């Protein structure tokens, strides 16, 4: 076929038009060339299809050897014709041959469908094992929401999706893997292995992968659950006047906690942005940096939005004040400084918004419309969603509106701080005061007659659907749908993590995050010593072991040399904090002696090496004679379960060699085995053309090009002649290491700021 | 993988009398045996046989230095008296996960006097009234058991 | 471009580039290419300075990451680029003094401790050598030079300053940036560090500038004048100034609308001086006579089916002496009778061919030859008698009587059912069980109404017509008007309703017309009401016994014309069924909203707790009458079927414009006090569509009657 | 046949690892069954 390709190319070039266009349009311009089709689209597909199905041979068969399997006329029925074609240059055929092929003919392979169409079979599995329930014929309240129509294996932006698809099913044309294949290495290797052994046309697989990865989101009327699993069946579950019970056949909380922790860590220091981004791109959740679920979900908690702004990602431009999401509708508010006496008797100089304004307001499950004038709230319309959410909405909108009544309702004091110990602006101090004491401005706010009307009904201070409501507040028994035109407009990030509009206006403040702690439902493994000196001993041990495991190659290489520089690593200094001071030195000496014996009089043993390395950070204290002390049970801070077993394993550390697996702090990790062989198996994902850098031009000294398989044969540091993307001959050099541009940039910034401080 | 491969890897193609321990784990065996260990072995201290599918104890070099032996996850069910004639110097015995029917299977250990610890986990014999007491008075030489003779110490 | 910068660069590098631009008073937004260049410069400098350290001896070496060595860990390269200008200058001076080297006159980018030199890093889109020489000339030999280009080539003052890995990595980053820019098409738009001070160039020529000059609003004389006026002048109440002078004779004329203002639409239908509306539908609806033959169930070609159906009725098949009951106005009795005889002979012929054997008599029977011959424009210009035909407006007719009778008759149950639907998969969810129950309750009602049989007959006829037209283009064809009818006992009768000659359908376009002549069996003698049949030439071809009661049998012959559009819509007329169900579904659902359980059995037949649902369906002697749920569903289905069959431009113009009055009446019934601006305008718009469409005239009549009913009932 | 069982972790008693499973089971009982369970202490008096 390659000979047929070259012959077709020569015949095409024989014409001068082909010669001039080919030599004129670069590879990039090819797209334009392709789009110059006739565009004589059929005006009515129904009539065309109806007419074609009645024709003798409407099917357009591609020229090939398949036709010989079937006669041109079977059982006196015409199937295919040998007449030439001009539209497709193939042959003609009829649905009769298609039906015969479905009846008889070659028998193909059934394996490919088990995994290739994984999403469809997962849909069928979720349908089959689903459990149905009763039907509620009563009216259903539905809200218009931006929902993901179908579940995704790993949500990623369209460009990353395309790059991943190419890296999966297009081994060639993979020049310079970006900072996206390493993030999705597991997906790359999984899909690569699954799709290997097939014969389907590559475009079908590419489109299916695009469906399986690229997100599809739409505005839909929903009531109840919102996960894609329920959205798949929304056509049956929901109903204007009927509802059905359905149960189809995590990382979010962990990312919330991690982002909050990063925010708190970075704020306390100066220049928070650089430190925050360093920790964010140096963090990982069990297989991937934080830019694998942050980039997945749309928006999220204020901390996640601030981190995404610090990183490179798109965030919804809703104004976050405390918990309120505000979307301006009209009016311009002039922020002018003014001196106002607070109900406590003190006088504060703060910014007030002159002029009328209106905002769509959201908080948890509560939606509403707020209309406010300067120093006064005017109107508020809400729907009954939840007592807690409604109370939060009322109080937060009250504080935001800066109503004089809210100021006159203060009774305690405003001198609070955050977990980092900083004094906030009076607005957020008032927010915290009122949220802590909800029954402070509610009592003195004043009451208003109930909204006498067909549906409008009031709500009292206790959040019960009781009449004699608050002044201004109204609850309508309808559906309020808000937050249209999510433009994701351009937003800047200041050093202090506080976002601002295209203009100087501030949208998100550094203190919007709520100071609420939780437990990471996943292994939050960072890569910087500064971060993890907060949590418990178990977390410290887990993070230190993860740090050791990640960069196992470097530590193993340094082990062979046999120098103390290997042991004086900052990563273990935090570990020193969780070892008893009176006995840490003995542990260090014992472990140093054991590891010296390991290097001298035996061979590689990764498990014990990892177990014993970290304890040697502290200086040793040998026996009076000089020999090292011997132990078999390393006690840790907290006692009891916080202890390491030298021989086989313990609650915090146990490695089984029968299956060669590692369990650290109750978490199983796969140590396929030992050896650079297992190192390369770990590297079994990565990306084609990941171990080679670009240097130089064609350089014909090497003759013709060489394939990836022949490329691997070259020893490190060689020069090879390869083709990049669609052609583009270049010269490449095999890499001797693995790179991390983010680490380099972070270290450069650290050195720069160290220099700045030292000069200062 | 086979017992021979494990023997070669552990001995590293050296004289048999160079290692005092063996690790025969995850090794397929012919009809449930422990082949690959010739009778020429003279020095051995520790043993380890797990997931070997051993069904009987009838092939074992005669020894006078072994003190520990480990059998687990096997369907072996037969008299162990042969250990006395093969190596009456056992101190640690581990039968965790084995398949023993009744008390009679562990009777032949009386003639051995050096045994101090015996392990029997999730065994069909372990689910009986006064099994702990019955075994104790049946093997007076025993000084340890599944771990709770009187206290907790480690091997 | 800024989006690419945000995506491909860290926020830190962007901040440093923005700070550098601010120091120079250069706006990053107005020069995004320059911002990208500065970001790339900072990134390459950081990439060069990373990973490189000096051992105690002073030999360059690599140091691992995340693995500190006490405090110093002295790096090989100290980055100077990115610091504030004052701080960078001071750092350069401090390094020069400390190492005893000359202070460069120009600020440096990096400093190498090993060589103890100041290194300048440059980038370019052109050849590395050219940029290297330019930078050397500008700066001199006091600073080492390292220039990298996007085409994988570089110029280094010293080849040992950077190892293979560093150059390879910087080149890989540059190539990735270039590829991403090309994919985003920013590469060509991107302009380097020598052209980024120019900006895009797009200047207007002479003709376009003149067109802009003359295309300025009144009062201006040049587009520069308009531009200055728009940019400078500020309106501060121009709208009120214009309104303060605009005449008070312009206004919406807001008038409140009451019941009395609403009057009957299209009073001319009542007038008896106008002719009775004729039957212009494609096929007979309430008069079809089904030549029914019991069949085992085998589906056969329509030609064979018609052959057999005529074979059963030998008297009508062999009838050859017609009795003209009426020749309408223009058609010729001889032509139509001979054409019908040829039709019968072709159908009854032994050969399977269903094409007319004459091919010449039909040419004049169908009037194909009675067409004008087109000439060229010149002769038409020269000739004086070649005028333009005056538009033919539709006749202004009156309310007929056959439309009401057909509306009644097509909406009644019949023992015969034809509408059958394909099976669907088993229903396992409760929701689909409820749906199946509702669907069964609906089809049990619709299937037995005659309107369903008429709809199926229309659909089958149009499907067969389309198939014949596509298969046969330039030959006259014979087409039976076939239908299949299953009785309650399961006997699958095949019904022949007549024949039709199809003319020559060789048409490239869709709007082109194709002529067909329809002969239809019927049991109705037109003399009973001759006003309904002014378009039909009929015979009396015999009589038949259905059960012992002899009834005549006539043949209605008429020439007509269709097109591919209506021809397709014939097979899409089944959607009426959907329109019949949707609304009723909603109705039922509303009931279900009231009380919790499912009512589809209650609304249809009723239960011990709820009475059967009854609508208002008809009237008699001025007394409105109720009607069961099934009867209302039948009425809606027949309304949809008529909306199809009698559909044309007039029907659309009538419905889409009388909806205004429908919504106004709905608002009035809710006491919203609707106001109107020009009522007579809406009424005229509506009534300029009631010309000759029978369904439009009957819709107007029913609208007037219902409006009278609403007026009389509004008293409460 | 009626239990749903997971594996949460592993305990150590004498330096030896023993697994821990979590038997999860749905059940249905009424207030009178609660009273019966409470009175289930009568087995002591019965045996005596």
Swiss-Prot record, chain B:
GO molecular function, a single term: histone binding
LRR repeat spans: 18-38, 43-64, 65-87, 89-110
Post-translational modification: Phosphorylated on serine residues, at least in part by casein kinase 2/CK2. The N-terminus is blocked.
Protein's cellular compartments: Nucleus; Cytoplasm; Endoplasmic reticulum
List of residues that carry Phosphothreonine: 15
Biased composition (Basic and acidic residues): 147-155
Transcription regulation listed as a keyword: yes
Tissue expression pattern: Expressed in all tissues tested. Highly expressed in kidney and skeletal muscle, moderate levels of expression in brain, placenta and pancreas, and weakly expressed in lung. Found in all regions of the brain examined (amygdala, caudate nucleus, corpus callosum, hippocampus and thalamus), with highest levels in amygdala.
One Gene Ontology term, aspect cellular component: nucleus
Major localization listed first in the record, in broad terms: nucleus
Modified residues (Phosphoserine): 17
A Gene Ontology BP annotation from the UniProt entry: intracellular signal transduction
Keywords, in A-Z order: Cytoplasm, Endoplasmic reticulum, Host-virus interaction, Leucine-rich repeat, Nucleus, Phosphoprotein, Repeat, Repressor, Transcription, Transcription regulation
Domain LRRCT: 123-155
Function: Multifunctional protein that is involved in the regulation of many processes including tumor suppression, apoptosis, cell cycle progression or transcription. Promotes apoptosis by favouring the activation of caspase-9/CASP9 and allowing apoptosome formation. In addition, plays a role in the modulation of histone acetylation and transcription as part of the INHAT (inhibitor of histone acetyltransferases) complex. Inhibits the histone-acetyltranferase activity of EP300/CREBBP (CREB-binding protein) and EP300/CREBBP-associated factor by histone masking.
Subunit structure: Component of the SET complex, composed of at least ANP32A, APEX1, HMGB2, NME1, SET and TREX1. Directly interacts with SET. Interacts with ATXN1/SCA1. Interacts with MAP1B. Interacts with ELAVL1. Part of the INHAT (inhibitor of histone acetyltransferases) complex. Interacts with E4F1. (Microbial infection) Interacts (via C-terminus) with influenza virus A protein PB2; this interaction promotes viral replication.
Protein family membership: Belongs to the ANP32 family.
Protein name (database record): Acidic leucine-rich nuclear phosphoprotein 32 family member A
Organism this protein belongs to: Homo sapiens
Residues of the full protein shown: 1 to 155 of 249
């Amino acid at each position: 076929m390659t000979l047929a390709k070259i012959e077709l190319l020569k015949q095409l070039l024989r014409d001068n038009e082909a010669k001039t266009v080919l030599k004129q349009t670069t590879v990039d311009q090819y797209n334009i060339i392709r789009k110059f089709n006739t565009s004589r689209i059929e005006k009515n597909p129904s009539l065309r299809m109806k007419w074609a199905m009645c024709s003798n041979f409407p099917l357009a068969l591609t020229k090939g050897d398949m036709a010989n399997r079937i006669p041109l006329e079977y059982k006196g029925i015409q199937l295919k014709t040998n007449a030439e074609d001009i539209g497709t240059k193939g042959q003609m055929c009829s649905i009769a041959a298609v039906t015969w092929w479905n009846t008889y003919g070659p028998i193909g392979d059934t394996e490919g469908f088990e995994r290739v169409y994984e999403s469809f079979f997962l849909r069928k599995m979720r349908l089959d094992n689903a459990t149905w329930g009763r039907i509620t014929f009563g009216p259903v309240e539905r809200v218009r929401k931006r929902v993901l129509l179908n579940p995704l294996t790993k949500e990623m932006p369209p460009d990353e999706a395309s790059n991943v698809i190419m890296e999966i099913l297009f081994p060639k044309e993979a020049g310079i893997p970006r900072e996206s294949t390493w993030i999705h290495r597991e997906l790359i290797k999984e899909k690569r292995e699954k799709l290997k052994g097939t014969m389907i046309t590559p475009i079908v697989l590419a489109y299916m992968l695009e469906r399986e990865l690229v997100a599809r989101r739409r505005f839909l009327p929903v009531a109840g659950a919102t996960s894609a699993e329920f959205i798949e069946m929304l056509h049956c579950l929901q109903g204007e006047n009927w509802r059905q019970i359905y149960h189809p056949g995590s990382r979010s909380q962990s990312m919330i906690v991690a982002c909050r922790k990063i925010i708190r860590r970075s704020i306390v220091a100066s220049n928070p942005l650089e430190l925050a981004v360093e920790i964010a791109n140096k963090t990982v959740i069990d297989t991937e940096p934080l830019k694998s679920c942050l980039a997945a979900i749309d928006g999220g908690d204020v901390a996640c939005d601030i981190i995404r702004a610090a990183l490179g990602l798109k965030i919804r431009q809703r104004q976050r004040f405390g918990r309120l999401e505000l979307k301006r509708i009209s009016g311009r508010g002039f922020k002018n400084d003014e001196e106002i006496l607070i109900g406590n008797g003190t006088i504060q100089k703060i910014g007030i918004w002159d002029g009328e304004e209106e905002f769509h307001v959201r908080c948890g499950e509560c939606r509403g419309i707020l209309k406010k004038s300067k120093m006064k709230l005017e109107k508020l319309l809400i729907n009954s969603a939840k007592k807690e959410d409604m109370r939060d909405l009322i109080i937060l909108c009250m504080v935001f509106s800066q109503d004089t009544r809210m100021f006159q309702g203060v009774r305690g004091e405003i001198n609070f701080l955050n977990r980092a110990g900083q004094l906030l602006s009076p607005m957020y101090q008032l927010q915290r005061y009122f949220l802590n004491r909800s029954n402070d401005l509610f009592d003195q706010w004043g009451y208003e007659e109930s909204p006498k009307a067909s549906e409008l009904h009031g709500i009292n201070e206790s959040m019960n659907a009781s009449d004699y409501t608050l002044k201004g507040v109204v609850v309508t028994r309808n559906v309020i749908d808000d937050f249209s035109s999510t433009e994701t407009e351009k937003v800047s990030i200041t050093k202090n993590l506080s976002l601002i509009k295209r203009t100087g206006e501030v949208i998100m403040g550094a203190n919007d995050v709520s100071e609420l702690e939780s437990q990471a439902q996943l292994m939050i493994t960072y890569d910087t010593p500064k971060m993890w000196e907060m949590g418990t001993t178990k977390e410290l041990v887990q993070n230190t072991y993860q740090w050791v495991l990640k960069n196992l190659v470097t530590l193993k290489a340094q082990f062979l040399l046999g120098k103390e520089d290997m042991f004086q690593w900052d990563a273990f200094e935090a570990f020193e904090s969780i070892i008893p001071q009176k006995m840490a030195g003995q542990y260090s000496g014992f472990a140093r002696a054991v590891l010296k014996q390991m290097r001298d009089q035996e061979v590689m043993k990764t498990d014990q090496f990892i177990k014993l390395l970290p304890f040697c950070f502290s200086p040793p204290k040998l026996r009076s004679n000089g020999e090292p002390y011997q132990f078999l049970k390393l006690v840790l801070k907290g006692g009891g379960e916080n202890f390491i077993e030298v021989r086989k394993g313990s609650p915090l550390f146990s490695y089984n060699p029968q299956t060669e697996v590692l369990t650290i702090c109750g978490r199983m990790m796969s140590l396929k085995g030992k050896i650079e062989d297992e190192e390369r198996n770990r590297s079994m994902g990565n990306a084609v053309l990941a171990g080679f850098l670009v240097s130089g031009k064609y350089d014909p000294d090497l003759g013709d090009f060489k394939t990836i398989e022949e490329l691997e044969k070259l020893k490190p540091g060689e020069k090879a002649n390869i083709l990049l993307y669609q052609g583009k001959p270049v010269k490449v050099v095999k890499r001797k290491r693995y790179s991390a541009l983010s680490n380099d940039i972070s270290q450069g910034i650290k050195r720069q700021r160290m220099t700045v401080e030292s000069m200062g | 993988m086979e017992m021979g491969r494990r023997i070669h890897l552990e001995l590293r193609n050296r004289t048999p009398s160079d290692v005092k321990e063996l690790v025969l784990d995850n090794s397929r065996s012919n009809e449930g045996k422990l082949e690959g260990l010739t009778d020429e072995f003279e020095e051995l201290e520790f043993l380890s046989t797990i997931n070997v599918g051993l069904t009987s104890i009838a092939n074992l070099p005669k020894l006078n230095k072994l003190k520990k032996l480990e059998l687990s996850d096997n369907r072996v069910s037969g008299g162990l008296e042969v250990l006395a004639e093969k190596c009456p110097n056992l101190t640690h015995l581990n039968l965790s996960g084995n398949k023993i029917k009744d008390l009679s299977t562990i009777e032949p250990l009386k003639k051995l006097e050096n045994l101090k610890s015996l392990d029997l986990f999730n065994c069909e014999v372990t689910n009986l009234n006064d099994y702990r007491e019955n075994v104790f008075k049946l093997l007076p030489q025993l000084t340890y058991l599944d771990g709770y003779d009187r206290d907790d110490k480690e091997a | 471009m800024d989006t690419f910068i945000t995506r491909n660069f860290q926020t830190t590098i962007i901040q440093k580039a923005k700070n550098t631009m601010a120091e120079f008073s250069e706006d990053p937004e107005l020069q995004p290419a320059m911002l990208f260049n500065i970001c790339v410069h900072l990134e390459v400098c950081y990439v060069i300075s990373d990973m490189n350290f000096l051992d105690e001896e002073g030999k360059a070496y690599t140091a691992l990451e995340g693995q500190g060595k006490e405090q110093n860990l002295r790096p090989q390269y100290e980055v100077i680029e990115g610091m504030p200008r004052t701080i960078a200058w001071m750092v350069q001076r401090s390094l020069a003094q400390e190492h005893g080297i000359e202070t460069p006159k120009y600020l440096a980018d990096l400093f190498d401790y090993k060589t103890k030199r100041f290194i300048e890093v440059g980038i370019t889109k052109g050849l590395a050598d050219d940029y290297f020489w330019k930078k050397k000339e500008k700066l001199g030999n006091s600073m080492e030079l390292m220039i990298f280009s996007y085409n994988q080539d570089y110029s280094l003052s010293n080849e040992s300053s950077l190892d293979e890995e560093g150059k390879g990595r910087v080149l890989s980053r540059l190539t990735e940036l270039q590829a991403e820019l090309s994919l985003k098409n920013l590469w060509q738009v991107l302009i380097g560090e020598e052209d980024v001070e120019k900006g895009i160039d797009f200047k207007l020529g002479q003709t376009i500038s003149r067109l802009r000059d003359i295309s300025v609003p009144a009062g201006f004389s040049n587009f520069e004048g308009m531009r200055s006026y728009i940019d400078n002048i500020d309106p501060k109440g121009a709208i009120e100034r214009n309104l303060a002078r605009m005449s008070p004779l312009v206004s919406v004329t807001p008038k409140k609308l009451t019941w009395e203002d609403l009057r009957p639409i299209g009073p001319h239908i009542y007038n008896h001086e106008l002719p009775e509306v004729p039957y212009n539908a494609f096929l007979l609806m309430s008069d079809e006579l089904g030549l029914a033959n019991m069949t085992e169930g085998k589906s056969k070609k329509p030609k064979t089916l018609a052959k057999e159906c005529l074979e059963k009725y030998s008297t009508l098949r062999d009838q050859t002496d017609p009795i003209l009951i009426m020749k309408s106005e223009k058609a010729n009795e001889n032509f139509l009778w001979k054409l019908w005889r040829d039709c019968v002979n072709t159908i009854s012929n032994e050969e399977m061919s269903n094409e007319l054997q004459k091919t010449n008599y039909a040419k004049w029977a169908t009037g194909d030859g009675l067409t004008y011959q087109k000439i060229m424009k010149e002769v038409a210009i020269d000739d004086e008698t070649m005028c333009q035909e005056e538009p033919k407006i539709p006749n202004k007719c009156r309310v007929a009587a056959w439309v009401q009778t057909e509306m009644n008759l097509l909406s009644t149950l019949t023992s015969k059912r034809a509408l059958d639907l394909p099976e669907i998969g088993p229903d396992v969810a409760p929701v689909e069980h409820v749906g199946s129950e509702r669907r069964k309750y609906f089809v049990n009602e619709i299937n037995y109404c005659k309107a369903s049989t008429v709809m199926m007959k229309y659909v089958l006829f149009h499907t067969s017509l389309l198939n014949e037209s596509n298969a046969s283009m330039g030959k006259y064809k014979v087409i039976p008007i076939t239908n299949r009818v299953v009785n309650e006992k399961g006997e699958s009768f095949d019904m022949l309703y007549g024949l039709a000659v199809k003319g020559q359908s060789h048409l490239r376009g869709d709007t082109d017309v194709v002529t067909v002549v329809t002969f239809e069996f019927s049991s109705t003698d037109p003399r009973v009401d001759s006003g309904k049949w002014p378009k039909y030439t009929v015979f009396r071809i015999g009589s038949l016994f259905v059960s012992g009661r002899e009834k005549s049998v006539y043949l209605y012959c008429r020439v007509n014309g269709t097109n591919k559009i209506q021809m397709k819509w014939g097979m899409e007329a089944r959607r009426c069924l959907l329109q019949s169900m949707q609304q009723m579904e909603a109705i039922v659902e509303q009931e279900s909203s009231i009380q919790g359980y499912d009512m589809t059995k209650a609304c249809f037949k009723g239960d011990r707790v709820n009475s059967p649902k009854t609508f208002s369906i008809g009237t008699q002697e001025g007394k409105l009458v109720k009607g069961s749920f099934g009867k209302a569903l039948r009425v809606i289905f027949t309304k949809c079927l008529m909306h199809y069959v009698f559909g044309n431009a007039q029907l659309e113009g009538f419905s889409a414009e009388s909806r205004r009055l429908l919504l106004l009446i709905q608002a009035l019934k809710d006491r919203k006090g609707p106001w109107v601006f020009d009522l007579e305008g809406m009424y005229s718009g509506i009534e300029e569509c009631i010309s000759n469409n029978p369904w439009v005239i009957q819709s107007a009549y029913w609208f007037n009657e219902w409006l009278g009913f609403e007026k009389e009932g509004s008293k409460v």
